[PDB]
């Protein structure tokens, strides 16, 4: 009865979701086929025919005129440099040892 | 004469069940990873199919209950997981025999993190931090169990070391692979017999070497 | 082995509260785990690999089983349980 409860409730809500999705797709299809170019009747009756923004565009154009750059990609210590140097040394030394042995 | 790690003078045999695989998971409820009970979880996690086995350390209960050196008291078991976790056991824990009760003893890894007894005076299972060498005795031999190492009788190997105050053996309790030899402690590997022994029979062979060396 | 109604099992101390007490026996004597962990130890011992050993078992119900050295007994427990059900009812197991 527990497995039938889970299976029955999931099948019930799954059929509800399928019916709702089919109804929404049918509504989209029918509203398309009755309002896509059938709105050509209403296309003509009812029609319809910045200082801070300029400051931001001024800063954009000024950076486009003259800019500069940033050194290199990161900031870290020489202790981390020595750690990564010993890491690359140990990796390449054990890799050369493995290539020698096989 | 019970033995914790904090009397590093005396003669001990330390077994380190190394590279174990006992790993917890959250399903409201709490399971741990067996190859047998769930494979789709291993595939969704993207793990290897084979090495989700705590059956190996649960079978290596037999060094904890290897009686003629444990009933002499002279043995101590540490476990180090692939998750980097060190679990001490006490040398008087009566471990759960069945794997379902060993599965139920995941409260040490998840909830309780140190178990007491019913009278609750001496701690049994601990989740201590690495290394192992600091918890070892002062002088301690430097031995892992490999296969392609030189083979020697463990009787003669323990006997020729006169008073080195202990003998520690790093046994890899994994399904397949290779144990951390040059990583932590062991510079030399002692191989057991000419066949690729499992972890349980490797521990039992070394334990019985200790028995007949130190006269049970 | 025992029936569930649909299913056959090997009698444990843990697969039941009182199937053993309905059969009359006590639950402390239904321990196949220990002959499993003996069989693992004997068949991973080096003397079995060297081929100087064979393992006979005999059930408390008086059933004698011959165990080849060449067998690979499964490492977890309930795989061994499902092996023992088919051994006890088909009287033979092939590779």
């Amino acid at each position: 009865k527990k497995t039938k409860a889970e299976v029955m409730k999931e099948v019930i809500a799954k059929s509800k979701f399928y019916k709702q999705e089919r109804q929404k797709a049918q509504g989209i299809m029918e509203d398309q086929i009755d309002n896509l170019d059938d709105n050509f009747e209403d296309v003509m009756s009812e029609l319809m025919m910045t200082d801070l923004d300029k400051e931001y565009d001024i800063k954009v154009k000024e950076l486009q005129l003259d800019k500069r750059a940033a050194p290199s990609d990161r900031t870290k210590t020489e202790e981390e440099k020595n750690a990564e140097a010993e890491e690359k040394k140990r990796e390449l030394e054990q890799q050369r040892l493995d290539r020698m042995n096989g | 004469p019970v033995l914790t790690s904090k009397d590093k003078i005396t003669k001990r045999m330390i077994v380190v069940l190394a590279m174990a695989s006992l790993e917890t998971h959250k399903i409201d409820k709490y399971v741990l990873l067996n190859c047998d009970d769930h494979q789709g979880l291993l595939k969704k996690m993207g793990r290897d199919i084979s090495e989700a086995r705590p059956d190996i350390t649960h079978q290596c209960l037999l060094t904890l209950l290897d009686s003629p050196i444990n009933k002499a008291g002279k043995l101590q078991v540490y476990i180090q997981t692939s998750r980097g976790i060190l679990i001490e056991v006490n040398p008087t824990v009566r471990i759960p025999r069945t794997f379902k009760r060993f599965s139920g003893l995941m409260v040490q890894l998840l909830h309780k993190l140190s178990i007491r007894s019913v009278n609750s005076e001496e701690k049994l299972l601990k989740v201590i931090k690495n290394p192992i060498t600091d918890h070892l005795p002062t002088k301690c031999r430097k031995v892992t169990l490999s296969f392609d190492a030189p083979v020697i009788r463990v009787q003669d190997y323990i006997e020729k070391l006169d008073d080195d105050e202990s003998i520690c053996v790093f046994v890899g309790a994994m399904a397949r692979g290779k144990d951390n030899f040059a990583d932590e402690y062991v510079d030399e590997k002692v191989g057991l017999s000419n066949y690729p022994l499992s972890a349980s029979v490797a521990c039992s062979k070394f334990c019985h070497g200790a028995e007949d060396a130190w006269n049970i | 082995t025992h029936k569930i109604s649909d299913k056959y099992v090997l009698l444990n101390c843990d697969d039941h509260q009182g199937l053993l007490k309905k059969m009359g026996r006590d639950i402390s004597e239904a321990r196949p785990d220990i002959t499993h962990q003996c069989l693992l130890t004997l068949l991973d011992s080096p003397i079995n690999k060297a081929g100087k050993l064979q393992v006979y078992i005999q059930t408390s119900r008086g059933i004698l089983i011959e165990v080849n050295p060449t067998v690979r007994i499964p490492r977890t427990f309930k795989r061994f349980s499902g092996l023992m059900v088919q051994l006890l009812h088909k009287l033979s197991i092939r590779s």
């Binding site: 979701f17 709702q20 999705e21 929404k24 797709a25 509504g27 989209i28 299809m29 029918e30 509203d31 398309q32 009755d34 309002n35 896509l36 059938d38 709105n39 009747e41 209403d42 296309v43 009756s45 009812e46 029609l47 319809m48 025919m49 910045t50 801070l52 923004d53 400051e55 931001y56 565009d57 800063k59 954009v60 000024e62 950076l63 486009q64 003259d66 800019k67 500069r68 750059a69 940033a70 050194p71 290199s72 990609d73 990161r74 900031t75 210590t77 | - | -």
Partner: protein, 251 residues
């Protein structure tokens, strides 16, 4: 009046799930009455799927004026209702990928979302969420520089500090205008807002992540007032690393 199938369109797009779109609501750009027709659809109700595809078409027809027409009246505040009504504050992947499709046209995206998000109601948690979804995906570079310019000339709010902190761990190649903007940011925080405010670890990590490598257009008097910056604002995590970037930077 309008042709009024928009009752049907609103009814299906309240709980739209999957599929195709009504093509009057696809060519709603090329009809002159888009705002006046959505004012009678009145979609206070929403589906997140039509939020995503509607902001796709709205990017396909947004300028400054159109962005003011739709995004600055109901859709930005609908995002605000979503973050306040989400009780665990879980702004959905629907809303996020709607923002990432929305971030494309950079013409007046400042007045599209960054001008009305500093109106009210922006806490530090919504702020780190908005800086995270900004730092996820592609950005205009010159408009990032201009954004750092105006948001640093804007008044002091810890949402704007975490905004500018994310915009400076963007790891840009900095123009002179923004470098001068940051040195008058130091001239803005003085005894400024040193007696009127105090600045803990978040402001600390903001200007430390500035000083990590944002030093390659800095001369010695700028090094001197950064020196007395850290001498005034001495924390525990300044000494070796900011002395290192002081000995590391160039002109």
């Amino acid at each position: 009046k309008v042709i009024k199938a928009y009752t049907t369109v609103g009814s299906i797009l309240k709980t739209w799930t999957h599929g195709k779109l009504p093509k009057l609501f696809k060519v709603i750009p090329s009809l002159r009455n888009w705002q006046d027709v959505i004012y009678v659809t009145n979609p206070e109700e929403w589906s997140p799927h039509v939020v995503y595809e509607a902001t796709k078409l709205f990017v396909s027809n947004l300028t400054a004026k159109e962005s003011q027409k739709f995004i600055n009246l109901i859709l930005l505040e609908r995002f605000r209702d979503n973050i306040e009504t989400s009780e665990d504050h879980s702004l959905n992947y629907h809303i996020y990928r709607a923002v990432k499709k929305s971030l494309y046209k950079p013409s007046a995206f400042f007045k599209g979302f960054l001008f009305p998000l500093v109106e009210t109601g922006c806490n530090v948690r919504e702020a780190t969420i908005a800086g995270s979804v900004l730092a996820k995906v592609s950005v205009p570079a010159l408009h990032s520089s201009a954004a750092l310019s105006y948001l640093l000339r804007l008044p002091f709010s810890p949402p704007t500090t975490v905004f500018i902190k994310i915009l400076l761990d963007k790891k840009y190649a900095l123009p002179y205008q923004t470098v001068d903007d940051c040195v008058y940011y130091f001239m803005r925080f003085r005894i400024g807002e040193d007696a009127t405010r105090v600045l803990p670890v978040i402001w600390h990590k903001a200007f430390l992540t500035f000083a990590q490598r944002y030093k390659n257009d800095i001369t010695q008097d700028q090094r001197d007032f950064l020196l007395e910056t850290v001498r005034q604002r001495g924390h525990k995590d300044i000494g070796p690393e900011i002395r290192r970037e002081l000995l590391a930077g160039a002109s």
